[PDB]
């Protein structure tokens, strides 16, 4: 005897393992037609079209198994499957709340719930700092804060301005004399890069020192600004406890370029992370949000968010996590009966595909997608 709450997680994991992309509900012919539309510019109409088409279609025995799925779409699909349309849209519109120093807000909201009665769904958004990469040097007579390009630092003869991504204008501090010094110490190219490491850390000309100074001024007060960008997305399902058993959490995620939700489930990484307990998962998330050690941040990020087995490589060397990260969350409750009915309608859609196996139904989907892609390409290429 298991709980309906645990039944939701069981059926979700086992249906995503077996059927994978069919769990999006996207018909095979739709998938093939869209694949054809995005593959046709990579097809040479001069050549032998039938084999180019045979190869383009060869590639989506893989595009159904390749990590072409966003983290955000995985979280969106999970939220809709478990909430229904109305509640999923309301939950999506809901604002995230930032994580506490040691995740205290989240753990407090979790402790004040009964493991017996409630089933919880937490959506996590990991934002990364995306700071301006271009300094613009402009006459005050030719500067309009309204029409100016956003996410940029602007050096005037008298002002050092930052326009964030939201169009907000910020004074960075320096007076008119310092601004004129920086203004004239910088050459008269239109824009300048703030990402040259030899200018930042090995400066030599007055231009280099001016740019490094400006970047230091921006760094010492980036607190005031909003330039975070969406980096990672995932969810955590906590089903109800069957009387006298311990409470466990289950992370669901995809990562574009690394793995799919199907890969994440087949590899059992959900349980692999579940074993470390929700309290220390939250504590390590808070550390990920409050640490300045690049190695600590990279280790946490890798073991939490990488494809299983690639933990030692996900954020090593070139992939170091050297920017700070912010962890935001939102929480809702699940009605397990509605989630199971959603999964049942999805299973009906799947069962419309002939086959005694999940294998054979997935192959019916795959063959239909390939056929649709091939015939759409022939339609678009007179062949």
């Amino acid at each position: 005897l298991e709980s309906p709450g645990f039944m939701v997680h069981k059926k979700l994991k086992s249906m995503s393992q077996s059927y994978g992309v069919m769990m999006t509900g996207v018909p095979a012919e739709v998938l093939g037609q869209m694949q054809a539309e995005r593959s046709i510019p990579s097809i040479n109409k001069t050549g032998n079209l039938k084999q180019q088409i045979a190869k383009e279609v060869s590639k989506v025995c893989h595009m159904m198994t390749e990590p072409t799925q966003s983290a955000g779409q995985a979280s969106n699909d999970v939220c809709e499957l478990l909430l229904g349309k109305i509640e999923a849209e309301k939950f999506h519109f809901t604002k995230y709340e930032a994580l506490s120093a040691d995740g205290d807000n989240l753990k407090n909201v979790l402790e004040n719930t009964a493991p017996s009665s409630t089933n919880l769904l937490i959506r996590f958004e990991i934002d990364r700092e995306d700071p301006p990469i271009v300094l613009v040097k402009t006459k005050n007579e030719n500067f309009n804060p309204e029409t100016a390009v956003k996410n940029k630092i602007y050096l005037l003869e008298n002002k050092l301005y930052f326009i964030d991504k939201m169009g907000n204008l910020f004074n960075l501090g320096p007076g008119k004399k310092k601004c004129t010094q920086l203004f004239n110490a910088i050459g008269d190219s239109a824009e300048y890069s703030l990402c040259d490491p030899f200018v930042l850390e090995e400066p030599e000309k007055p231009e280099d020192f001016a740019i490094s100074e400006i970047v230091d001024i921006f760094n010492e007060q980036k607190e005031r600004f909003d330039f975070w960008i969406g980096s990672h997305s995932f969810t955590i399902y906590i089903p109800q406890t069957l009387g006298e058993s311990p409470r466990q959490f289950y992370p669901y995620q995809a990562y574009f370029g690394s793995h799919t939700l199907q890969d994440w489930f087949v590899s059992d990484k959900d349980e692999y992370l579940s074993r470390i307990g929700i309290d220390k998962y939250i504590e390590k998330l808070a550390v990920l949000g409050k640490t300045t050690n690049t190695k600590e941040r990279s280790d946490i990020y890798a073991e939490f968010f990488s494809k299983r087995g690639r933990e030692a490589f996900f954020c090593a060397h070139l992939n170091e996590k050297r920017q700070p990260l912010r962890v935001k969350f939102k929480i809702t409750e699940i009605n397990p009966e509605l989630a199971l009915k959603n999964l049942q309608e999805t299973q009906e859609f799947i069962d419309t595909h002939p086959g005694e196996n999940p294998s054979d139904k997935v192959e019916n989907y795959r063959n239909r997608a390939k056929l649709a892609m091939t015939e759409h390409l022939e339609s678009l290429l007179d062949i």
Binding site: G25, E29, M34, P41, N151, N342, T346, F349
Partner: protein, 106 residues
Amino acid sequence: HMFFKDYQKKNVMRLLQDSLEKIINEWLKTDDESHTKLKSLQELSEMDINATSFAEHSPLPDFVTRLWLDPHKALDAMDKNISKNEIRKLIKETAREIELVFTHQK
């Protein structure tokens, strides 16, 4: 019931939007001195929902124009619970957000 049809619809529309993103991105990366492609993207993102004569003659990708005129003749596998006016509004939203992702305003 009701649940699965709209779930399928939203996922189909998302796949359509991502494909439009990829196509128009690589189309825009290779233009000329006049910024012709960017100009037609500008024109398309603000165009009234009921116009249909620009695709007579336009530098836009053929998929975009075909999807604008009649979307369901282009992708005959797409369900008719997605309307023509939903699709051109999706096209306009995508074209605007990309026209601004690459004029670097955002």
